[PDB]
Amino acid sequence: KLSEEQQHIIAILLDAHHKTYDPTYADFRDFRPPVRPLSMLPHLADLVSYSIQKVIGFAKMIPGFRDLTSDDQIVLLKSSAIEVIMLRSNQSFTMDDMSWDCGSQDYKYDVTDVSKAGHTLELIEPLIKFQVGLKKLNLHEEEHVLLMAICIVSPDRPGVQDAKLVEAIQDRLSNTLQTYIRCRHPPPGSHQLYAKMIQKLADLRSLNEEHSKQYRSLSFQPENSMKLTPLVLEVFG
């Protein structure tokens, strides 16, 4: 049975998500336009930079997150950002044509589009397989927003000072997610669903690592760095 504390956590994360993920993708118009080598880099760099800001806005409204130090907030978001971007992207991802469909054909991104931003298939092929497996989980929105929040508040991230407080915050969230699955997720959909969600967090670490590797290559060349945003340069280094 879902406690009062737990119901409140869910209502807050749902609202936090509704406030930071616009499913009409209205802002995409403000990005440097798409072009179909590094042809898609200006558009996707802007997209990612925007999405970083949205993730920060989401994170801020996570119950317990405000209690963390500024430094701890920084290290959690710096290491989580790419992963949460990949998680939140599942909402626009469609298995029909293995694409992110963000409202229009201009903002509909397939394997070849997202490969035109300096990243190879060593990231994109596993990213796309991740999106398929995650989509097959058929998560309730409540589960989706809990998983993103759990991903952000991970005690093992490099450079974390107050790991025990980070763990305490995450546990509250984990326990909520587990209880929610038990109470509100009907079998068979619910079968080992928690274990499968936590596995997605493992997959994301692997994707983050590969993204890091390729970001270093991309960004070693100043003419490519030039095409990013200052936020992207700060967050990804």
Partner: peptide, 10 residues
């Protein structure tokens, strides 16, 4: 060491 990130978090 991350001014923009800090600004957006405060």
């Amino acid at each position: 060491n991350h001014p923009m990130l800090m600004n957006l978090l405060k």
